[PDB]
Design a protein around this ligand. Structure first.
Ligand SMILES: Nc1ncnc2c1ncn2[C@@H]1O[C@H](COP(=O)(O)OP(=O)(O)O)[C@@H](O)[C@H]1O
Lengths: 93, 66, 370
């Protein structure tokens, strides 16, 4: 189930994903495996779309925090006047 | 002012500064002054010791003089 | 330029001072002011009215000891001026307040007026070349040498926890309650009255402090020990009497872990630590739990650290290494940290010059408060 989504309003963003679904069932009958094939399909697709949405939900604090935090670990802004004015004590350990 | 006075006065003034800063280095290198510095170092007071060479602009003055 | 920075560690109960670079504070004495109560009759008596330091401690019976600072906030500035002036006297420093920059410890979350009027006092009556007000937790961590960790202090009038990350003391996680040593002594006085022994004189409250300093401990189980009758050890007064304490020795410092006994909606020390840690970045909780430093004289009770460990384990999440350090200089932690901080070359750029104070004013201090 490969997905490609592009968005470029005042920028550029591309979502590329796929889930290597793997499932099995014995071919019992035709109508049974037809709607059962749909059962596996509805399962994996509802699962996959929902999971993708929640991956978007947990992205401000996990993925981005792997790249760039929203706020530093001190949870405050930067006193540029402090860093430039004097060394924070980094020389001392 | 670099143009204050005649040419020989300004040129001789830079010469005077050269030998005078060397005399300041002479007064700096005496063992009595070093003894006072040793007192402040042995007494764990690093302020006057480090400032004796950094706060005094004698080092940079002597290097430009040289 | 000046001679050397003087690290004056304040404290609502014990002021501590000395020059920077010193190993231990050479000058420490209680932060009280005693003036006589009786009548001068015989000539040749103790001349002078206000006494501070060892002389005020010696002739303790005559004085009417009061404190000018309470809960890290100065209530009387005249007595504080005399105390600071006493620090610069011939009995303590023998120097002048014109050739020494001053490092000044100060408790967090205090009013702006403390820094403002204290700065006026120094730069105007003392005319110090440079003043620098700082925190106390930052100094205690500098004294231990490590750099990231919380600091749990409980001096005489305040108690707080500061999660420090490499020197940047996180200002959004400093919990602070006002239940410290002096208040524990006060509650101990109440319990001594309930025992039958009365101590109410101002120069007798100090005896109550002495009892707190050498006859109290912390029970591990707070209730199991209350349901038993202890050995009821005695106590010798300076007078020579005898006081059997009993249950009024473990419930007295119990106040720090439950300020319900004093009737207050504040929290215990353990809750101050856990809230100070939990109101921080989730990525630093394990590092903060692995580095807790105690300081302040109220952390000297018997069984203090052990009970703190038990309490924190009850509040911390499961299987997180909790580690409480407790150096041997909890009384001198902030002062030793001041000696390390002010003895650096960056301190020249870290203070506030007198010229700057005359130019901008108090706003310059709040600007360069860190
Ligand atoms: N052995 C002790 N046990 C319990 N409390 C003590 C002991 N020694 C001192 N104290 C209390 O601790 C206080 C000292 O803390 P202090 O140094 O005043 O902190 P700060 O100086 O930051 O106010 C004193 O008021 C005293 O009441």
């Amino acid at each position: 189930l490969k997905i490609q989504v592009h968005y470029y309003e005042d920028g550029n963003v591309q979502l590329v994903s796929h889930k290597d679904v793997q499932d099995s069932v014995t071919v019992s009958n035709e109508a049974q495996t037809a709607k059962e094939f749909i059962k596996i399909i509805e399962h994996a697709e509802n699962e996959y779309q929902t999971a993708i949405s929640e991956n978007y939900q947990t992205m401000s604090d996990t993925t981005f925090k792997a790249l760039r935090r929203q706020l530093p670990v001190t949870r405050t802004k930067i006193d540029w006047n402090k860093i430039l004015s004097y060394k924070i004590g980094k020389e001392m350990q | 002012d670099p143009a204050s006075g005649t040419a020989l006065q300004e040129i001789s003034f830079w010469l005077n500064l050269e030998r005078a800063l060397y005399r300041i280095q002479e007064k700096r290198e005496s063992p009595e002054v070093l003894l006072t510095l040793d007192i402040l170092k042995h007494g764990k007071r690093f302020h006057a010791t480090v400032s004796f060479d950094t706060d005094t602009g004698l080092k940079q003055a002597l290097e430009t003089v040289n | 330029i000046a001679n050397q920075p003087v690290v004056i560690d304040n404290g609502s109960g014990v002021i501590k001072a000395g020059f920077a670079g010193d190993q231990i504070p050479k000058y420490c004495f209680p932060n009280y002011v005693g003036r006589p109560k009786h009548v001068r009759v015989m000539a040749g008596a103790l001349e002078g009215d206000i006494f501070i330091g060892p002389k005020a401690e010696e002739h303790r019976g005559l004085l009417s000891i009061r404190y000018p600072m309470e809960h890290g906030i100065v209530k009387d500035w005249n007595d504080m001026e005399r105390i600071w002036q006493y620090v610069y006297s011939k009995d303590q420093l023998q120097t002048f307040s014109e050739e020494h920059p001053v490092l000044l410890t100060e408790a967090p979350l205090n009013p702006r007026k403390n820094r403002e009027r204290a700065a006026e006092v120094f730069f105007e009556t003392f005319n110090v070349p440079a003043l620098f007000i700082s925190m106390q937790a930052v100094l205690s961590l500098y004294a231990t040498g490590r750099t990231t960790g919380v600091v749990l202090d409980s001096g005489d009038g305040v108690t707080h926890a500061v999660p420090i990350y490499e020197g940047f003391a996180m200002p959004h996680s400093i919990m602070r309650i006002d239940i410290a040593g002096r208040d524990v002594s006060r509650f101990l006085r109440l319990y001594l009255r309930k025992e039958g022994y009365d101590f109410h004189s101002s120069s007798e409250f100090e005896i109550v402090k002495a009892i707190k300093e050498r006859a109290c401990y912390l029970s591990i189980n707070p209730q199991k020990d209350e349901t038993l009758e202890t050995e009821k050890a005695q106590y010798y007064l300076p007078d020579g009497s005898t006081i059997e304490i009993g249950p009024s020795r473990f419930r007295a410092p119990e106040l720090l872990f439950r300020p319900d006994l004093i009737g207050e909606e504040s929290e215990g020390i353990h809750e101050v630590l856990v809230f100070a840690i939990q109101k921080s970045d989730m990525d630093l909780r394990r590092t903060l739990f692995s580095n807790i430093v105690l300081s302040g004289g109220s952390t000297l009770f018997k069984g203090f650290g052990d009970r703190l460990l038990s309490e924190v384990k009850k509040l911390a999440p499961k299987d997180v290494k909790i580690r409480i350090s407790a150096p041997q200089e909890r009384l001198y932690s902030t002062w030793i940290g001041g000696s390390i901080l002010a003895s650096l070359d960056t301190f020249k750029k870290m203070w506030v010059s007198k010229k700057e104070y005359e130019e901008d004013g108090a706003r310059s201090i709040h600007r360069k408060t860190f």
